[PDB]
Design a protein around this nucleic acid. Structure first.
Ligand SMILES: [Mg+2]
Ligand SMILES: [Mg+2]
Ligand SMILES: [Mg+2]
Ligand SMILES: [Mg+2]
Ligand SMILES: [Mg+2]
Ligand SMILES: [Mg+2]
Ligand SMILES: [Mg+2]
Ligand SMILES: [Mg+2]
Ligand SMILES: [Mg+2]
Ligand SMILES: [Mg+2]
Ligand SMILES: [Mg+2]
Ligand SMILES: [Mg+2]
Ligand SMILES: [Mg+2]
Ligand SMILES: [Mg+2]
Ligand SMILES: [Mg+2]
Ligand SMILES: [Mg+2]
Ligand SMILES: [Mg+2]
Ligand SMILES: [Mg+2]
Ligand SMILES: [Mg+2]
Ligand SMILES: [Mg+2]
Ligand SMILES: [Mg+2]
Ligand SMILES: [Mg+2]
Ligand SMILES: [Mg+2]
Ligand SMILES: [Mg+2]
Ligand SMILES: [Mg+2]
Ligand SMILES: [Mg+2]
Ligand SMILES: [Mg+2]
Ligand SMILES: [Mg+2]
Ligand SMILES: [Mg+2]
Ligand SMILES: [Mg+2]
Ligand SMILES: [Mg+2]
Ligand SMILES: [Mg+2]
Ligand SMILES: [Mg+2]
Ligand SMILES: [Mg+2]
Ligand SMILES: [Mg+2]
Ligand SMILES: [Mg+2]
Ligand SMILES: [Mg+2]
Ligand SMILES: [Mg+2]
Ligand SMILES: [Mg+2]
Ligand SMILES: [Mg+2]
Ligand SMILES: [Mg+2]
Ligand SMILES: [Mg+2]
Ligand SMILES: [Mg+2]
Ligand SMILES: [Mg+2]
Ligand SMILES: [Mg+2]
Ligand SMILES: [Mg+2]
Ligand SMILES: [Mg+2]
Ligand SMILES: [Mg+2]
Ligand SMILES: [Mg+2]
Ligand SMILES: [Mg+2]
Ligand SMILES: [Mg+2]
Ligand SMILES: [Mg+2]
Ligand SMILES: [Mg+2]
Ligand SMILES: [Mg+2]
Ligand SMILES: [Mg+2]
Ligand SMILES: [Mg+2]
Ligand SMILES: [Mg+2]
Ligand SMILES: [Mg+2]
Ligand SMILES: [Mg+2]
Ligand SMILES: [Mg+2]
Ligand SMILES: [Mg+2]
Ligand SMILES: [Mg+2]
Ligand SMILES: [Mg+2]
Ligand SMILES: [Mg+2]
Ligand SMILES: [Mg+2]
Ligand SMILES: [Mg+2]
Ligand SMILES: [Mg+2]
Ligand SMILES: [Mg+2]
Ligand SMILES: [Mg+2]
Ligand SMILES: [Mg+2]
Ligand SMILES: [Mg+2]
Ligand SMILES: [Mg+2]
Ligand SMILES: [Mg+2]
Ligand SMILES: [Mg+2]
Ligand SMILES: [Mg+2]
Ligand SMILES: [Mg+2]
Ligand SMILES: [Mg+2]
Ligand SMILES: [Mg+2]
Ligand SMILES: [Mg+2]
Ligand SMILES: [Mg+2]
Ligand SMILES: [Mg+2]
Ligand SMILES: [Mg+2]
Ligand SMILES: [Mg+2]
Ligand SMILES: [Mg+2]
Lengths: 249, 112
RNA sequence: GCGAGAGACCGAUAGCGAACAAGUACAGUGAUGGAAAGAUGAAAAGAACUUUGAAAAGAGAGUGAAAAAGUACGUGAAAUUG
RNA sequence: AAUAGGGUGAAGCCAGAGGAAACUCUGGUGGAGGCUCGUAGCGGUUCUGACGUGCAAAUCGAUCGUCGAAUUUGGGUAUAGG
RNA sequence: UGCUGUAAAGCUGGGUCGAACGGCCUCUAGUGCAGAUCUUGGUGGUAGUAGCAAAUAUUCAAAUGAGAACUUUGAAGACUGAAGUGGGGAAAGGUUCCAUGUCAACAGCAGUUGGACAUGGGUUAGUCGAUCCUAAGAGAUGGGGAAGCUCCGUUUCAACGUGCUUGAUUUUUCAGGCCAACCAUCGAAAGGGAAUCCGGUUAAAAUUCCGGAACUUGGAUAUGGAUUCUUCACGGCAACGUAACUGAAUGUGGAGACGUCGGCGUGAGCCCUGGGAGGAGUUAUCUUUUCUUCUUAACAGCUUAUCACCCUGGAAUUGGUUUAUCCGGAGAUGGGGUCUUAUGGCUGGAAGAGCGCGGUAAUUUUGCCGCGUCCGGUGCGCUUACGACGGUCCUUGAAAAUCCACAGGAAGGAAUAGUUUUCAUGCCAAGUCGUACUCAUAACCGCAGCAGGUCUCCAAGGUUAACAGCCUCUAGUUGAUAGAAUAAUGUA
RNA sequence: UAACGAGAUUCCCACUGUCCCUAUCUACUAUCUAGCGAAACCACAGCCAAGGGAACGGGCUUGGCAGAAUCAGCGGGGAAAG
RNA sequence: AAACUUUCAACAACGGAUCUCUUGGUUCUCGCAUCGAUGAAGAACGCAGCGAAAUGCGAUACGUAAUAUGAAUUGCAGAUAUUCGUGAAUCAUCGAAUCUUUGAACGCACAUUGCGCCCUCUGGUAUUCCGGAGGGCAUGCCUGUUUGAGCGUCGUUU
RNA sequence: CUUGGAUUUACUGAAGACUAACUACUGCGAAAGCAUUUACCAAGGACGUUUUCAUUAAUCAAGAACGAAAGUUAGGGGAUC
């Protein structure tokens, strides 16, 4: 047969992300002396739309502690953050929406976003619109914090990892139907080349494991082993179960 | 009516290939190539157009006198009047409160 | 590659693709592909001159051993043709 | 970079009428939409028309689809033979 | 012309021809053709046959010539009908451009003509492009893979400046003061971007030449003005104004710099139209008539605006206000001002130019003279530019070079004199490459002068909703083998 | 299943040369001329009937017959060409 | 009976076989060891009195010098060309030179005749700007020189 | 379901519901309904009144608000039944 559409994406010729209009990478500040020992104050200059992103971004200006210079940061805007607001980041920052605090400095039940998986990676968890991270508890002896991720998973993170207080702005986006193929076209025009999708069952046997037949049908189980190889992993990969989800999981 | 042609090799209606139609002293209708319209100098605080400053294409500011490019005030050609006024009042009031917070702190550094 | 001497070899549809302004003309976007084409006469002596014609040419003449050698050039087969 | 001229008439807004209230009705205004008729354009339904040693190794004529967007298109650029 | 042999063949007469060749005994082989849809070359019948029929359409005369359906000129009849059969360009071609000569071949008839053939001529730039910038991307270096051709990576685990700015020194040595996040390079003749216009001129070039009038950048540099004894100016309540009117490192901003649609407003060009001053046409009759000229560039000065802003004042009986309902104690309405100069007006440029007439010069290079070139109006008009608005998106609609302002306060500054080229005037320079022509029913690609394909700009009158269809003006073509007839069968 | 469809199908109104059943007209061909001038195809060729025969002959056998050179049409045959 | 068709012969066509040639090819043998950063092989563009190509050459351009030789070259023309001679022609020979723009190709770049920087001289009233002439500036590696870096490290002095 | 240690035992944790006993011929609300603590928000009946207004009222076709459980649509939760 032929190389299937799954495998052509790794080469990344026409499958790279369309990034001309993007407004910068959304990251926290580099963890420095001020954030480790006290707090540093910045001011929100802009709240802007980032193409390909549901969450708006905030442009926050900080002073450089060591040279006469202004540093502009690109944060993910939490809902309620406004232009001209003062943003405080550090160990001694107060528990206000938009402030960046270490996870150990936040009491249980604190809603936090753009949380660091590892100390200083500048934000990994809960970055999309309407999403957040809940702080479950602390383990001060081991310097660890328990959090709940938007997927429902419980994670143990260093208490020195940082997060931004509040919920990511732009939530409720999925509640409205797109209603049109053109709307999805414009949605993916600034994301990547993944739309529209032809069904593999509608192809020929060269194109896909599902192609061929005198009727459109998969022919074999569409649940594929985790240990299958590239060109085989088309369908439900390592599916623990199938069918309509009934009851609680 | 007389019809005109472009005066340059560019045949396309691009942003830099805009023309006007002008009648010459020879009684002819010719195309006159129009330079791109200048944009106004704007405030760095509020983004509004600054008054008293000439609207020129950026290289033309080098060849014009200084009175065209500035206003006789602090932040003259950079900030508008209202944004400078707000800076002055904010600087004065905030620094006044800095003294108040200092003397008050010294009041709690000798009795508590 | 350079320099030589040879052959029971081929003799211009052969022998190298190329005996010649041949890796030329020409084709292809490109990698590449790639021909055809030698011979008047010892010597141009390559036909002065007259005449018919708009001219090309023709008819006389002239050169030559030969024009049954005139560059559409040694010989000049067959198909095909008057 | 390009895309006549019409039809329909969504929100929002103005005025009037009715009602105890919750609210309802009418006339305008407005100018929405992968809306619609229809040019340029893009496409290519049918005649199973012409042609079918063609004008053409896919064209010609009428008829037709669509025609403000998942639109059409120049140039630059990327992806290369299991 | 015959003879010999069963035969494969051998020999011979005549003609043609011009330089080598044969018999016999042996040797040797790339050694014998009717075929292989054989190979290469050549030639027939078909056959003077199929055919040379899309794109409305030609005709008379003269000239030229040996020769004219086809060339030239004149007269006419037509068509394209401004989304053109008009006038330019990008790609591509490459001399096809122009003049002269010229007809063997080519232009599927012809040819005196030609994009053919031959000989010459022709492309003029500081301002138009390239050049420079960065885009998607391409790609060296330090490194790391790979047997290697080379692959990855683009500042990457790097000691990465051929650094600058000054006071200089004339001691051709220096003294230092700042920084070195990022930063090789290539990548757009449609993106970004320093600066030019009008009139004239050639057989063929022109935003390039000539005449005149400007502008930008780089450099040098003096005078005037400005400023200083209160050293680095004044005025205005303010918005802010001006001829100027210090400002290092470093920093902050702005411009470059940005979708699309809708109606509205303003301008420009075009369309329409009145008077007057000219010219042409019609005139049996009518028509103070029909057509036409009456124009004004870049650049300089003054003035000119929606929006926005400032001062005054204090608002319900709410008012102002758009086609579109938004605004006002976060200060409306009212009154008075400030600003951007888009755009228009006046003046200079500039009437001296161009245009329209009339009168004269002459084989005549080329003219010379006189007069006029003026004053308006109109709009749901067309196109286009701009403006203030409004709608729209799970879509929010490049970058960089480059230029400016501001913050900062380093350093340097006067009185018998000091400073500055962001005020005026003056001086010098601007290199390299492209530039002709076609851009298509004949200059490109489809084997070709092929009904195909190939990006874009300008756009008159009537009818009309209309940039449709139909007719016409300017411009351009009248090209497509032709003649005679008009059966069948066609095609439309 | 409203709306939509150059999708497939049945019926009805309107409409008509689709038909009964054909006729007439126009232009361009065809046609004839001057000039220009291919190609497919071709063992040899080219009248029938029967016979036998590789069982459907242009040729063979037996008969019918049979008279130069040809033009426009035509599509039975050449088990026509590709 | 003509015409027409077919056959044959003569002459003339069409065409280029046959014959005969041959500065070419092919194969065998013998001898030799010599490309390039001192810039090769290759490419592009030019160069002649009148040349398009081939051949030769490089702005010194169908060639300059030198050695040898000894009267040509030739299609035409023409010497401020030559003949008992420093003398015609000559890739005869060849030891000195020239050798455009390139190319491993070397300042950077190259779909550009694009853009720098350094030294000396020179023109424009110029250490700085503009013009011209000449000479330079690639990378890896080796030896050496100089200038450096690192509490890697030795000695000494508080 | 259980020798792979079930059931049982102690400690710890997480989820959702639900508010026992107190709880009654007791309370509140227009009805449906309402039961852990505290805070906040706005209501309400009765009582008291030598306050106030003076007929403003009763019931009501049309028309409205609320309306157990089950059920429907879309998110979230889904312990127990
Ligand atoms: Mg899907
Ligand atoms: Mg699908
Ligand atoms: Mg299929
Ligand atoms: Mg398969
Ligand atoms: Mg399978
Ligand atoms: Mg299948
Ligand atoms: Mg299916
Ligand atoms: Mg000013
Ligand atoms: Mg030999
Ligand atoms: Mg040969
Ligand atoms: Mg050969
Ligand atoms: Mg011969
Ligand atoms: Mg004669
Ligand atoms: Mg002879
Ligand atoms: Mg002879
Ligand atoms: Mg001969
Ligand atoms: Mg013969
Ligand atoms: Mg429309
Ligand atoms: Mg068609
Ligand atoms: Mg058909
Ligand atoms: Mg036919
Ligand atoms: Mg149509
Ligand atoms: Mg493209
Ligand atoms: Mg004889
Ligand atoms: Mg003989
Ligand atoms: Mg001979
Ligand atoms: Mg012999
Ligand atoms: Mg043989
Ligand atoms: Mg043969
Ligand atoms: Mg043949
Ligand atoms: Mg033939
Ligand atoms: Mg014929
Ligand atoms: Mg035809
Ligand atoms: Mg004529
Ligand atoms: Mg017409
Ligand atoms: Mg010409
Ligand atoms: Mg001809
Ligand atoms: Mg002819
Ligand atoms: Mg020619
Ligand atoms: Mg320019
Ligand atoms: Mg340049
Ligand atoms: Mg990049
Ligand atoms: Mg390396
Ligand atoms: Mg570049
Ligand atoms: Mg450019
Ligand atoms: Mg842009
Ligand atoms: Mg440009
Ligand atoms: Mg001009
Ligand atoms: Mg011209
Ligand atoms: Mg000039
Ligand atoms: Mg200057
Ligand atoms: Mg002053
Ligand atoms: Mg908008
Ligand atoms: Mg608009
Ligand atoms: Mg200008
Ligand atoms: Mg004037
Ligand atoms: Mg107007
Ligand atoms: Mg337009
Ligand atoms: Mg100045
Ligand atoms: Mg030109
Ligand atoms: Mg064509
Ligand atoms: Mg070709
Ligand atoms: Mg137009
Ligand atoms: Mg039209
Ligand atoms: Mg024709
Ligand atoms: Mg005819
Ligand atoms: Mg339905
Ligand atoms: Mg349908
Ligand atoms: Mg459809
Ligand atoms: Mg016929
Ligand atoms: Mg039989
Ligand atoms: Mg028979
Ligand atoms: Mg037969
Ligand atoms: Mg017989
Ligand atoms: Mg037949
Ligand atoms: Mg027929
Ligand atoms: Mg021979
Ligand atoms: Mg370039
Ligand atoms: Mg109780
Ligand atoms: Mg009760
Ligand atoms: Mg009721
Ligand atoms: Mg209910
Ligand atoms: Mg649910
Ligand atoms: Mg459940």
């Amino acid at each position: 047969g032929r190389v299937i559409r799954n495998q052509r994406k790794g080469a990344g010729s026409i499958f790279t992300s369309h990034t001309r209009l993007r407004k910068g990478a959304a990251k926290l500040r580099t963890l420095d002396y001020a954030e480790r020992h006290g707090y540093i104050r910045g001011v929100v200059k802009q709240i802007i739309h980032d193409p390909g992103r549901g969450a708006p971004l905030a442009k926050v200006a900080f002073r450089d502690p060591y040279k006469y210079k202004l540093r502009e940061e690109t944060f993910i805007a939490n809902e309620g953050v406004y232009t001209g607001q003062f943003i405080y980041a550090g160990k001694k920052a107060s528990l206000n929406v938009g402030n960046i605090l270490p996870l150990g400095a936040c009491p249980e039940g604190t809603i936090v976003s753009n949380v660091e998986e590892k100390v200083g990676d500048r934000g990994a968890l809960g970055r999309t619109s309407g999403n957040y991270v809940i702080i479950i508890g602390h383990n001060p002896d081991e310097n660890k914090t328990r959090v709940k991720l938007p997927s429902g998973a419980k994670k143990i993170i260093s208490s020195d990892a940082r997060g931004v207080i509040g919920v990511v702005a732009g939530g409720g986006r999925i509640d409205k139907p797109l209603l049109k193929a053109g709307r999805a076209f414009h949605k993916y025009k600034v994301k990547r080349n993944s739309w529209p999708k032809t069904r593999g069952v509608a192809m020929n046997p060269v194109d896909h494991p599902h192609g061929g037949g005198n009727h459109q049908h998969i022919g074999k189980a569409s649940t594929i082993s985790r240990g299958a190889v590239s060109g085989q992993k088309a369908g439900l990969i390592a599916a623990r179960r199938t069918g309509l989800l009934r009851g609680t999981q | 009516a007389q019809r005109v042609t472009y005066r340059r090799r560019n045949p396309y209606n691009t942003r830099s290939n805009k023309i006007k139609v002008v009648k010459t002293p020879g009684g002819k209708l010719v195309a006159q190539h129009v330079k791109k319209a200048a944009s106004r100098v704007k405030c760095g605080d509020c983004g509004s157009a600054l008054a008293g400053i000439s609207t020129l294409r950026p290289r033309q500011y080098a060849q014009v006198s200084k009175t065209h490019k500035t206003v006789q005030r602090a932040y003259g050609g950079s900030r508008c009047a209202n944004c400078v006024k707000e800076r002055i009042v904010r600087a004065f009031l905030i620094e006044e409160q800095k003294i108040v917070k200092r003397v008050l702190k010294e009041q709690q550094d000798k009795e508590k």
